[PDB]
């Protein structure tokens, strides 16, 4: 039940000693399914730091201190292993390789595009695959709609304008317009679809009076000629 978010909620509510998660087998082990080895850089580790620093006062009501300290031992051991491996890795380098430039370009651009979830070109119907497109657009809409409205730039070209304490520079909004062109272009999609239908179903709906090589064929001219035959008058 997200104990690694329950610690964050108890920290941000500023009352963590008053509850202390009721560390028994019935409560502290029901959310764990040891502790699950936190994932973040420090956002789930500083919480463990503060949690141990608050639980130094009771020291016996909470039996889960030992598994947390075992994970501190694991973190210290992994850190010492990485420091020894970084000491050896800087000694295992060849004296000459002369890494190529125009492949370093491609690795940097490819890593940068693979960070922020966009498609990388290689250079090295069916409503199953219709929903898998219409579920990537809701991703982008509900990711752009969580940006703060007070978003603003600071380009490297405001130094040539000498902005005072209150001067209102003229390149402050080169990202918030761009973060609304996407968010409103991804909501006007089923309007340009309905305009493209009215375009194609009135250009292709003639198809034999505008295109020259179709209205000059034998069979099209014969069909258009034969539909215009006025019915025979008996007597």
């Amino acid at each position: 039940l997200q104990e690694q978010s329950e610690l964050m909620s108890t920290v941000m509510n500023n009352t963590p000693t008053t509850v202390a998660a009721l560390a028994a087998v019935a409560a502290a082990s029901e959310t764990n399914g040891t502790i699950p080895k936190p994932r973040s850089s420090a956002q789930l580790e500083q919480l463990l730091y503060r949690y141990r620093a608050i639980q130094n006062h009771p020291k016996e009501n909470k039996l889960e201190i030992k598994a947390i300290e075992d994970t501190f031992r694991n973190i210290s051991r992994d850190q010492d292993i990485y420091e020894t491996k970084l000491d050896t890795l800087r000694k295992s380098i060849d004296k000459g390789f002369q890494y190529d430039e125009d492949l370093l370009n491609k690795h940097l651009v490819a890593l940068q595009l693979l960070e922020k979830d966009t498609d990388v070109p290689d250079y090295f119907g069916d409503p199953d695959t219709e929903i898998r497109i219409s579920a990537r657009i809701s991703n982008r809409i509900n990711e752009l709609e969580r940006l703060p409205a007070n978003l603003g730039t600071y380009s490297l070209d405001d130094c040539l304008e000498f902005i005072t304490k209150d001067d209102l520079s003229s390149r402050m909004d080169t990202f918030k317009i761009k973060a609304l062109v996407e968010l409103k272009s991804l909501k006007l999609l089923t309007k340009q679809k309905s305009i493209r239908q009215k375009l194609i179903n009135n250009v292709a709906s003639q198809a034999h009076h505008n295109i020259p090589y179709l209205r000059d064929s034998p069979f099209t001219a014969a069909a258009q000629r034969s539909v215009q035959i006025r019915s025979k008058v008996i007597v």
């Binding site: 990485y82 890795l89 370009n105 929903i131 990537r136 991703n139 730039t153 490297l156 402050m172 080169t174």
Partner: protein, 89 residues
Amino acid sequence: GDDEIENFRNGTPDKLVSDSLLKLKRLRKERILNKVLKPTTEERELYFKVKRILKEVILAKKVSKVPINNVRAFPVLQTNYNGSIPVVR
């Protein structure tokens, strides 16, 4: 840790990078075609392992260009404030 980069640093550094980026691209296709949103713990672990290697050459070799291309801006928050004229009902 590293556990492989010591062994592969003895030869060329660059083959593992492309052989890992192709795996990232295949895993990204397999995440798109599965309606999953969070990345797995198998490519995240495989992501930093890429970014380490490209760091170390820049630490070690000092490759002749290491090109610089930036958008020359970055987003910052700016102060907001309500209007001072009161509301009319």
